């Protein structure tokens, strides 16, 4: 039911034209965090959404990852956060999916990556390949 509520709110993105509201992102994030016992399901659901969604929703999907990881690090501590480490497992493939976004959304992904790097959200060995993927597209 925790996973059901999260999935419901995540897929509700399909009802809206991006950019997505702060309030909606907050709702999704709060549901993810409440469901921390099921963090593996939460990550799986986010990744599935990003794999399968329309191009206009790739950036919104990335923003869901960013929002969850940022709130989790804030709420539980950077060292104790379980979401960034779990998202890291498939992250190369997740980003391959994300970069299938409209060309005018590509700069938005790079922005997120640059901020993750600045804040050491992921190790360089993860961030650099993701940055390299954006550059190889140009």
């Amino acid at each position: 039911e925790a996973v059901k509520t999260f999935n419901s709110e995540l897929y509700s993105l399909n009802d809206y034209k991006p950019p997505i509201s702060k309030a909606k992102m907050t709702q999704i994030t709060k549901a993810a965090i409440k469901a921390i016992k099921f963090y593996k399901h939460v990550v799986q659901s986010v990744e599935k959404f990003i794999q399968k969604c329309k191009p206009e929703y790739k950036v919104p999907g990335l923003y869901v990852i960013d929002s969850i990881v940022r709130q989790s690090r804030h709420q539980f501590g950077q060292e104790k956060d379980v979401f960034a480490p779990r998202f890291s497992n498939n992250i190369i493939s997740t980003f391959q999916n994300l970069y299938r976004c409209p060309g005018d959304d590509k700069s938005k992904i790079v922005r997120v990556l640059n901020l993750w790097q600045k804040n050491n959200v992921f190790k360089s060995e993860i961030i650099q390949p993701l940055l390299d993927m954006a550059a190889a597209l140009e």
């Binding site: 509201s21 929002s67 940022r70």
Partner: peptide, 8 residues
């Protein structure tokens, strides 16, 4: 009103 990748 749109989400931005900012600190919570």
């Amino acid at each position: 009103p749109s989400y931005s990748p900012t600190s919570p």
